[PDB]
Paper text:
However, as a consequence of allosteric coupling between the inner gate and the pore helix near the selectivity filter, opening of the activation gate in many channels leads to a series of structural changes at the selectivity filter that renders it non-conductive (the O/I state), a process known as C-type inactivation. This experimental approach, combined with targeted mutations known to affect the stability of the C-type inactivated conformation, allowed the structural determination of KcsA in its ‘transient’ open-conductive (O/O, mutant E71A) and deep C-type inactivated (O/I, mutant Y82A) conformations at near atomic resolutions (2.25 Å and 2.4 Å, respectively). Trapping KcsA in its open conformation has allowed the development of an atomic description of its O/O and O/I kinetic states.
In this mechanism, water molecules would diffuse into the inactivation cavity by a conduit formed by the apposition of two neighboring subunits. The entrance to this conduit is guarded by Tyr-82 (Thr-449 in Shaker). For instance, replacing Tyr 82 in KcsA with Alanine accelerates C-type inactivation gating, while in Shaker T449Y slows down this process. These experimental observations suggest that this position could work as a gatekeeper, regulating the diffusion of water molecules into the inactivation cavity. In order to address this possibility, the crystal structure of the closed Y82A mutant was solved at 2.25 Å resolution, PDB = 5 VKH, (Rwork = 0.1749 and Rfree = 0.2037). As expected, a smaller and less hydrophobic amino acid at this position not only creates a septum or a channel that communicates the extracellular milieu and the ‘inactivation cavity’, possibly enhancing the diffusion of water molecules into it, but also allows the solvation of the inactivation cavity entryway, as evidenced by the additional crystallographic water molecules detected at this region. Interestingly, it has been shown computationally and experimentally that recovery from C-type inactivation is in fact, dependent on the occupancy of this buried waters into the ‘inactivation cavity’ and that as predicted, changing the water activity at the extracellular part of the channel slows down KcsA’s inactivation kinetics.
Author numbering:
A (entry chain B), F (entry chain B): 1 to 106
B (entry chain C), C (entry chain C), D (entry chain C), E (entry chain C): 22 to 124
């Protein structure tokens, strides 16, 4: 099964800086990685699909990059409402799996 | 119309149906098998086309019994289609050569 | 019945026999070669079908001399079968076009 | 000249055009997709040939929607070409056998 | 003998020659390219056969310009051979159906 | 040849807990892994075939998971009669090979 490693588990940034979340797959999975945001007591929300594709309604300061085993979710200039947990999820092989999450702290 | 052209068009229609149905059924068969990659519909449709044409890059392939049975139906539909079209072409060329030589 | 249909049916029967015999013989040839994957019968039968149809995903392939000779017989049986069927189809279409035009 | 030979030559010309145009368009479609390998023209031309002949080693394959659509046009041009040539060959052989038997 | 059978046998002979010559030339073209695997004759002969039949597992493939040109000649010899045989089969079936119906 | 690593070699559990045996293959072998139980002075007994498929006569508290290189045999709520050595075996490539075994201790 595809193991997804998100490290580090906690990211500490200053307001308005660029932040990057890492997600590493235990084997090559093309661009089949999707990124979700979960705020406190909220349900997950899709941010980026297929490693880099935008979702309507998501602010444009979110972007994603990478292919193969190494994936990055990026926030241009973080702000308070970005405080949340961030999960990656692969859909290359069955079963779908999730990474363990990175918390954003400001 | 002539039978060979009706048969070729029929076969093209049936082939399109086999590609779509096979894509749906491949995903249905392969989800639940750990390691399977034929598990989302867009790339399953692509796989069904490169299987029907007998190209088979190997970027995707089924691992279950039912996914492989579906693959076999897709291969045979593709090869039969291509055979039907070749035969219809031959029939057209043979008849036009008969006429051109005066029967 | 007509010769082209008898030949096509014969070829389909022989092809099924070649697929089963080739699966058995592929496992027999490949066991004993370190690294070989064509070594259990269900997936060997699948390999023989995708070889006969000339799809060749490459998920499985023989590495020994005898396993590759078996593969060649399977390829040729599959290509010959498909050629026989195309030719039988052509013969049917040509004869029906002869009749439809009044000979 | 006879229609089947004109059609075969036409199809060979069109196939060459499809191979070159498909190589150009494959690179155009695939650049910009992370991970894509069909992104320089010499190896894209090689890929288009092994796709048209339905060999499909799998050393290269498209990953985008448009690169895969181009692949489908290339497959169909190659299979149609080969069908056209087989049918032209059949037409030639049938006519020469008609003459050899005295019509 | 009849032309279609002479042409088919000729094509089978030429195909065998193309397989052997292509195996020799593939090794000659590919040695000297770092990473190339088509570099010893037994497995090059196997590669040439699975290329001629258009199976293309992808266990082996050429990387140089000349090795790929050789591959193209092998593909075309294999596809042409198979087309020639299909056409010869069609010609045989058409003539026997003519006789069986009384011309 | 496929090397199968079973680690740890000894697993110590409490009655009724869930236990997991690890088996790692030196290269990817799909789901071609089979699991055997061997009690003291007994012959091996097939528990799970093709990574996750049940065998008739085997209690349902046994299950297996994984694909690729990483495989897990699981026992829901272990009991005394599960005390035994546990072996994985691959059939993806010739020759078939065995892992070195994990002993269950309660
Ligand atoms: C029950 C549903 C079965 C039908 C599934 C619908 C598929 C939708 C395709 C269009 C959406 C694009 C999404 C995407 O990113 O697609 C490409 C990868 O980027 C995948 O390439 C492909 O979808 C391959 C296309 C093959 C063309 C086949 C033509 C047959 C003559
Ligand atoms: C001497 C013996 C030769 C015959 C071998 C018997 C094979 C038995 C197959 C059914 C058992 C299922 C086990 C299993 O899990 O099978 C699939 C993988 O899950 C493998 O897929 C396959 O077996 C591929 C099937 C190919 C269909 C070929 C049809 C030809 C027109
Ligand atoms: C818009 C441009 C489309 C045309 C692209 C031009 C390609 C130029 C090829 C010659 C330059 C050699 C560079 C090189 O190192 O090439 C080989 C690898 O070493 C790659 O093998 C190939 O180029 C494969 C050749 C396939 C032959 C196809 C014949 C069709 C019947
Ligand atoms: C200029 C020389 C060109 C001819 C090369 C001579 C090749 C000799 C083959 C026999 C020696 C066995 C060594 C060996 O271990 O061979 C197999 C791997 O174990 C490889 O499988 C193969 O050689 C594949 C055989 C393909 C059969 C092709 C039949 C065509 C209808
Ligand atoms: C080959 C046509 C029948 C395919 C049925 C697939 C259903 C899969 C269920 O697991
Ligand atoms: C090609 C038909 C003969 C195959 C015989 C296979 C026997 C393998 C023994 O090692
Ligand atoms: C299938 C013929 C049309 C291909 C057009 C490719 C253009 C790619 C643009 O992203
Ligand atoms: C395609 C026929 C000619 C092949 C010549 C190969 C010679 C390779 C020299 O590097
Ligand atoms: K192929
Ligand atoms: K093929
Ligand atoms: K292939
Ligand atoms: K392949
Ligand atoms: K590969
Ligand atoms: K063909």
């Amino acid at each position: 099964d595809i193991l997804l490693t998100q490290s580090p588990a906690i990211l500490s940034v200053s307001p308005g800086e660029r932040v990057s979340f890492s997600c590493r797959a235990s084997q090559s999975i093309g661009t089949d990685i999707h990124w979700y945001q979960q705020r406190t007591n909220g349900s997950p929300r899709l941010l980026i699909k297929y490693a880099s594709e935008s979702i309507s309604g998501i602010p444009s300061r979110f972007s994603g990059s990478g292919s193969g085993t190494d994936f990055t979710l990026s926030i241009n200039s973080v702000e308070s409402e970005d405080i949340a947990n961030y999960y990656c999820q692969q859909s290359n092989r069955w079963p779908f799996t999730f990474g363990s999450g990175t918390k954003l702290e400001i | 119309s002539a039978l060979h052209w009706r048969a070729a068009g029929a076969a093209t229609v049936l082939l399109v149906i086999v590609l779509l149905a096979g894509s749906y059924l491949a995903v249905l068969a392969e989800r639940g098998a750990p390691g399977a990659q034929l598990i989302t519909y867009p790339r399953a449709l692509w796989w069904s086309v490169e299987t029907a044409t007998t190209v088979g890059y190997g970027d995707l392939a089924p691992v279950t019994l039912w996914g492989r049975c579906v693959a076999v139906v897709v291969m045979v539909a593709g090869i039969t289609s291509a055979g039907l079209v070749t035969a219809a072409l031959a029939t057209w060329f043979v008849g036009r050569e008969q006429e051109r030589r005066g029967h």
